[PDB]
Structures are given as C-alpha cells and as structure tokens.
Amino acid sequence: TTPLVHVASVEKGRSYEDFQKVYNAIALKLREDDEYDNYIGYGPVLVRLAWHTSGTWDKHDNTGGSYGGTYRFKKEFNDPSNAGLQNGFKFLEPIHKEFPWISSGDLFSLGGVTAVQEMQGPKIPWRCGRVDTPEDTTPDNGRLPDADKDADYVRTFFQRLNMNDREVVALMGAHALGKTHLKNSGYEGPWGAANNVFTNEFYLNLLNEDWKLEKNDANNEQWDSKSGYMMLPTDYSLIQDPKYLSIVKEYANDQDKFFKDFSKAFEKLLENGITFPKDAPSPFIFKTLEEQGL
Numbered sequence: 444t445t446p447l448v449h450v451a452s453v454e455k456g457r458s459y460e461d462f463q464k465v466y467n468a469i470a471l472k473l474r475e476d477d478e479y480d481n482y483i484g485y486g487p488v489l490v491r492l493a494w495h496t497s498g499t500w501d502k503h504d505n506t507g508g509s510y511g512g513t514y515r516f517k518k519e520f521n522d523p524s525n526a527g528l529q530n531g532f533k534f535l536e537p538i539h540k541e542f543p544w545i546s547s548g549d550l551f552s553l554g555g556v557t558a559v560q561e562m563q564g565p566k567i568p569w570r571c572g573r574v575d576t577p578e579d580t581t582p583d584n585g586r587l588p589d590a591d592k593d594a595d596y597v598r599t600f601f602q603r604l605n606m607n608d609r610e611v612v613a614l615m616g617a618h619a620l621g622k623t624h625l626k627n628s629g630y631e632g633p634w635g636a637a638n639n640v641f642t643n644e645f646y647l648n649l650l651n652e653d654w655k656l657e658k659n660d661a662n663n664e665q666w667d668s669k670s671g672y673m674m675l676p677t678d679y680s681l682i683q684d685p686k687y688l689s690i691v692k693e694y695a696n697d698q699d700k701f702f703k704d705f706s707k708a709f710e711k712l713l714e715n716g717i718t719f720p721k722d723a724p725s726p727f728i729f730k731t732l733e734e735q736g737l
C-alpha cells in the first residue's frame with residue numbers, strides 16, 4: 444500500500460525527432476478529420492482526454508495520474524466521467540499503430556499538447572518516459588470532479604492535484620475549447636464562438652455575457668447566454684468567488700499571461716506523479732505543422 448515511485452523511463456533509443464514525428468502524425472490527422480463534432484475537429488476532445496487521464500492523480504499516495512496510461516483498461520474508459528472520450532481514443536488508435544513504441548501515457552498526454560499547439564495555443568513543454576502499468580493499477584471511478592458544485596468544492600478538489608487558485612483558474616480556460624454534449628455529461632452547449640482556436644475567450648465570456656440560470660433537457664442547471672453559450676456551475680463559480688474573480692479578470696485582460704500560466708499548469712498536470720531522473724532529457728518543445736511548413 445506504500446506509495447510507489449514512478450520513474451520516467453525514455454522509450455528505448457528514442458529522442459526529440461522521434462516524438463516530433465508522433466506529434467506531426469497527430470497534427471496531420473487533426474487536419475484531415477476536420478468534420479468531427481460538426482466541424483469542431485478532434486482538438487478539444489484530445490485535450491479533455493489528456494486531462495482526464497491525468498486528473499485521477501492523488502498526491503497523497505501517488506495513485507492514478509498520467510504515468511500508467513490506464514485509460515486503456517475497461518474500468519477507466521467506462522468511467523461515467525469519461526463518457527465521450529472514446530472518440531479521442533479511437534482517433535489515437537491509428538497513431539499508436541504506426542508508432543507502437545510510444546507508451547500509452549505518453550501518447551494520451553502528447554495528444555493534448557499537440558491539440559493545444561495546433562489550435563494556436565501556447566507551446567507546452569512535454570517530457571517522455573511514462574511507462575504502461577498493469578490493469579490492477581487502474582484507479583477506481585469517481586476521482587474526476589463534478590460540474591454541478593460551487594467555488595468551495597472546486598478549490599478543495601484541486602488541492603488533491605496540488606493546484607492553487609491561479610493554476611485552477613488558468614486550467615479552466617481550456618473550456619474555450621469544444622462544448623458540452625448532453626449525452627456525455629448532462630450539459631449542452633459551447634462556452635464560446637471559437638471552438639477550435641485556443642484563446643482567452645472563456646474569461647471574456649464569463650465577464651461580458653449576460654448569463655441566466657436555466658435547466659437543460661437533462662434537468663440540470665447551467666448558465667446560458669443569448670449568444671448561444673453556456674457555463675457550468677463550476678465555471679460560473681469562478682466569478683462568484685472573489686479570489687477566483689480577480690484572476691479571471693487578469694486573464695481576460697492579458698492574453699500572454701494566460702498563455703504562459705496555462706502552459707505551466709497544463710505541463711504540471713500532465714507530469715503529476717512522475718519522477719524525472721536528474722539526467723533525463725530536458726522537456727521537448729515541438730514545432731507546429733505551420734512552423735515546419737507542413
């Protein structure tokens with residue numbers, strides 16, 4: 444029961460170029476399969492997958508986390524909290540088939556990094572070395588957070604992932620991406636207009652839209668705006684809590700600051716629970732397809 448240490452182990456003989464190739468394959472497929480989810484593309488769901496496979500981590504005993512790539516196991520991919528992520532896993536299947544040497548955890552997390560960057564978001568340094576662990580290491584369902592709670596719930600919950608107020612608010616900015624799907628989560632609607640472009644729109648919408656507390660077709664409350672956007676109760680709590688509100692305003696007024704803080708928090712999220720040897724490779728910063736002229 445003693446907390447196990449997960450030491451990053453580089454896939455045998457692999458280096459930056461090998462991973463840039465995987466990044467490129469993911470990026471090229473994101474471009475090709477553009478029709479998904481009414482042309483939103485697979486970017487958002489890949490970011491959600493990267494987060495859900497990392498968000499099971501418990502700092503108290505180092506269980507869960509991105510290291511083991513346990514989402515490949517039935518108990519975890521059937522977690523009600525992960526409904527809809529099967530689309531992201533299916534997307535990555537041909538990628539893993541072409542590059543069988545990459546670990547599942549490295550693939551799931553790299554998928555998120557690739558999606559953020561290809562969607563014009565900040566560069567996210569990424570480290571390789573996650574190693575697949577047995578099915579009995581799969582964390583039980585119920586470790587991911589709920590969306591119907593308040594600011595106090597959010598603050599306490601994220602302490603388990605060792606995230607502070609600024610880190611939590613920055614991470615939530617990813618909701619500028621994609622949308623909620625009634626069938627998956629009991630919530631329906633996008634948070635903004637630019638569904639597959641990474642910007643600080645989430646914060647701007649929270650502060651500038653006129654929100655009304657309504658019930659959706661699943662009988663759950665959510666905040667709606669005449670513009671056709673929505674906010675989860677947890678999203679809205681970010682402007683109800685005075686400490687979160689200050690940070691929301693900061694990001695709504697400084698795109699660069701949001702990008703920098705999100706990058707750090709997202710990398711931290713994807714690396715929680717992993718011990719990187721002193722002589723491990725430095726974090727990789729992948730070039731986008733655009734930067735490579737591809």
Ligand code: FMI
Nearest residue numbers: 487488490491494588589614617620621622623624627628
């Ligand atoms: C850093 C990234 C991130 C964080 C930290 C983070 C944190 C949290 N999220 Fe969010 N998320 C991300 C990224 C991130 N999310 C993205 C990109 C999406 C869109 C997915 C898609 O469009 O398919 C979604 C979609 C989504 C949905 C709709 C799912 C669906 O119906 O398909 C819900 C209900 C929630 C709830 C919650 C919380 C409040 C409960 C878990 C929460 O704590 N999310």
